Design a protein around this ligand. Structure first.
Ligand SMILES: [Mg+2]
Ligand SMILES: [Mg+2]
Ligand SMILES: [Mg+2]
Ligand SMILES: [Mg+2]
Ligand SMILES: [Mg+2]
Ligand SMILES: [Mg+2]
Ligand SMILES: [Mg+2]
Ligand SMILES: [Mg+2]
Ligand SMILES: [Mg+2]
Ligand SMILES: [Mg+2]
Ligand SMILES: [Mg+2]
Ligand SMILES: [Zn+2]
Lengths: 49, 108, 45, 152
RNA sequence: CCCAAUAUCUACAAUCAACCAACAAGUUAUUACCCUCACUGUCAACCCAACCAGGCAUGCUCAUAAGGAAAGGUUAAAAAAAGUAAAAGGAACUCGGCAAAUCUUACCCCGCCUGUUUACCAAAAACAUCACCUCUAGCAUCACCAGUAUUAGAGGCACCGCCUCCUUAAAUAGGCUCCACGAGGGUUCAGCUGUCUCUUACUUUUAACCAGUGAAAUUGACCUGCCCGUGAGGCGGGCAUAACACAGCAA
């Protein structure tokens, strides 16, 4: 009956693994979006070069 | 406020060279009786500690090269073995971190 | 708060201190000639 | 006045103090030996000891699991705590960590300290031995050992 | 970084532009030419503030996929700064409920209202302002104005309507009509609270110590005491008096 917390990296930390996990956070924000409108909104709202 | 008069070199010398401001001679230095380097009593021989940190760093570099990436703290003990040292009968089931130089005399 | 009265602008700088503005009036030609006499190597802005 | 206050003051407040000590303790559990400023290590030694105490209770206990969840930040170390450290000290009932002072830091000349968990694999710290038992004063004291033992 | 010439035109808004409703009223026909991509910006941690918790227009992300580090090490003295908590009492503080905590009420003076002002001590009871009144002016192509007496300029006043003893235990305080509004001024009810009776604890910065880097006002010379008198560390008469840092205080 071992409740081991998961083996994941941290969210708020300033490293590379934290950056990847925040990438997964917004990608899971789009996976859990039902309208194609919102999927395209979230998947293109950040304007970069 | 502000000074009313310059202070002479005499007063400044009686302040700057007062004993309370001098650097005290340290009564607790000696020589590592075996190793023969300077040290304070309550502190580690600096040369010995450096020669230990070098080996710790080399061992840890091997550990990193073997564990691959981050988040890989093993769940078993670890033993480090130098050249021509077969894993002893007590160290089976413990991760081995091979090194390629003769074991230091100070490593027991 | 003061001290930032110079908000640079190339159009303004070339319009109100430039070669053509000096040469568009006798006073400006006098200015250019003074600065030619004193030896300057920056006659006009 | 600060009579009977056992906790140092460090960081930007109490919370930052707990977080600093938490990072030190995580580094200690991950590498089993760390060099840090002396006062911070002296503050963290008690926490490392009690962490091993909580880890002895074992995985099944939930209070210990929550505590080790808070006090370890990269969770790969929580296995270790409950399967390499706490088992290692099944015999010792106290004093799992040794703390030494080392040459002051080059840059800011702070008072340093190496702290490690007893029994690790690393090359051993150059501990200071006592005087050999065969020295003059020790020999005279050994003679007194004998002569007092026979009398009693 | 532009455009071949000439004539013609060019009455009706924009507001999801359709319903209602308004006022501040918002290019081509002919003639000439069958030519092709040259030239410049493109960097950065950046610019104006002597180096900087300041200043800096627009588009998009609205809490971050981007960007960063509030603690050189230590100890936990005073005084100072910011914050959190507080017994009973709740303005007795004080010039004044300034600050803080809590959210209610009532009136009075001034000004009608929104607005504007003394960049850097005054935001107001001052300026402006609709409304009213007075004075001047019969009119062309550079303002008033491509206007014309219901117009233009210059002044005063300030819509509109009406006319030309109580309070407190105690009190020097408060008590032309005219809604609405005010970081305006004065007063009051109730609450609230460390404002206070009367302070206390903890945290952070400062602080003190170790290490690095390292100013400025000020300075006749100083081997820089106290009391009484004279007119005051320095004169006189008494007293005191081994030298030397460090942290405080402000006669
Ligand atoms: Mg670019
Ligand atoms: Mg980032
Ligand atoms: Mg600190
Ligand atoms: Mg910092
Ligand atoms: Mg500091
Ligand atoms: Mg109270
Ligand atoms: Mg106003
Ligand atoms: Mg006002
Ligand atoms: Mg210093
Ligand atoms: Mg006197
Ligand atoms: Mg002093
Ligand atoms: Zn040694």
């Amino acid at each position: 009956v071992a409740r081991y917390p998961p083996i994941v990296a941290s969210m708020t930390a300033d490293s590379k693994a934290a950056r990847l996990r925040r990438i997964e956070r917004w990608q899971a924000t789009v996976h859990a979006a039902e309208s194609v409108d919102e999927k395209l909104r979230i998947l293109t709202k950040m304007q970069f070069m | 406020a502000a000074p009313k008069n310059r202070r002479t070199i005499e007063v400044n010398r009686c302040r700057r060279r007062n004993p309370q401001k001098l650097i005290k001679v340290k009564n607790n230095i000696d020589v590592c009786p075996e190793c023969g380097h300077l040290k304070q009593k309550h502190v580690l021989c600096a040369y010995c500690y450096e020669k230990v940190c070098k080996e710790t760093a080399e061992i840890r570099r091997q550990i990193g090269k073997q564990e691959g990436g981050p988040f890989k703290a093993p769940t078993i003990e670890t033993v480090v073995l130098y050249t021509g040292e077969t894993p002893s009968e007590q160290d089976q089931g413990k991760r081995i971190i091979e090194r390629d130089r003769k074991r230091p005399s100070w490593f027991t | 708060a003061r001290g930032n009265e110079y908000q640079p602008s190339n159009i303004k700088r070339k319009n109100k201190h430039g070669w053509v503005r000096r040469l568009s009036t006798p006073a400006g030609v006098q200015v250019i000639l003074r600065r030619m006499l004193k030896g300057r190597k920056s006659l006009s802005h | 006045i600060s009579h009977g206050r056992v906790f140092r003051r460090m960081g930007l407040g109490p919370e930052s103090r707990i977080h600093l000590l938490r990072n030190l303790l995580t580094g200690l559990v991950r590498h089993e030996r760390i060099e840090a400023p002396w006062a911070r290590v002296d503050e963290m030694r008690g926490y490392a000891e009690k962490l091993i105490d909580y880890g002895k209770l074992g995985d099944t206990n939930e209070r210990a699991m929550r505590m080790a969840d808070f006090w370890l930040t990269e969770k790969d170390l929580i296995p270790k705590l409950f399967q390499v450290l706490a088992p290692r000290y099944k015999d010792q009932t106290g004093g799992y960590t040794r703390m030494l002072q080392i040459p002051n830091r080059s840059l800011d000349r702070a008072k340093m300290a190496v702290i490690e968990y007893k029994g690790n694999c690393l090359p051993p710290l150059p501990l200071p031995r006592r005087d050999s038992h065969l020295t003059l004063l020790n020999q005279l004291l050994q003679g007194l050992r004998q002569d007092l033992r026979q009398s009693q």
